Amino acid sequence: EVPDNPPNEIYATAQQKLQDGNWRQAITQLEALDNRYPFGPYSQQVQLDLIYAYYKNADLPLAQAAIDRFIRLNPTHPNIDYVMYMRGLTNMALDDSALQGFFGVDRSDRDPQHARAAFSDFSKLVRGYPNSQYTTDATKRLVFLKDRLAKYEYSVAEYYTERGAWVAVVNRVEGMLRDYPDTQATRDALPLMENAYRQMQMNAQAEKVAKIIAANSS
């Protein structure tokens, strides 16, 4: 429902229907340029406001679709850092972005199958682009998303402490254990695998994991 214009005009309709606020109009002329004019040298910049304005009506993964439209079609560009940062940001808000947790219960049990992939994106941003504007903020994400999977796994470690596969207690701890040496969740599940040891009468191996706890009291 949009006709053809001069190729420098549809930017403004992309720019200014972005300035409308009713979010069903912004993409409408954002997309209206690169269909009639994909041959402009600025069509990858149209993708940058596209991945931007895709978020607005809870219509997220076209951003990730337009994230990869930057990647494969266009070999040489420094703005992949934005594309890599918006990659995990698209990948994150599929997990926990609803307002149903408004009453005091958060959402780490809600499975981060794509915020699994958000960790993949933010790890490649901090290794692909060092001084880009998003490296620091993604590093903040890489701290919790590690732990966001951990308490998820610790819930299973609690669930395995609940149901009673005490071997599967320690592995849910061991899956949390061997990857990262930083979480406090690593400290507190460390007696539970050893409580699993204590219920499996591996009290010495419990104590050996309590020996791990012992110097970690800091």
């Binding site: 926990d96 972005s97 504007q133 998303l145 930083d182 690593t186």
Partner: protein, 59 residues
């Protein structure tokens, strides 16, 4: 266009992913050195550039 005079350049739900500190790392006993570093955790730290989260520029 429609919100609680809100919801234009911000995040829905909650924004727990910024306000926390880095995870309080542990000081292992001598000899009990597990490969707890054995994850994919090639996360290199460099001071460039830009802001964080909602305050970070999004052009």
């Amino acid at each position: 266009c429609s919100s609680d005079s809100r919801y234009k350049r911000q995040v829905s739900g909650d924004e727990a992913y910024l306000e926390a500190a880095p995870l309080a790392e542990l000081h292992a006993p001598a000899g009990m050195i597990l490969p707890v570093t054995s994850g994919d955790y090639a996360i290199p730290v460099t001071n460039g550039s830009g802001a964080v989260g909602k305050a970070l520029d999004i052009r």
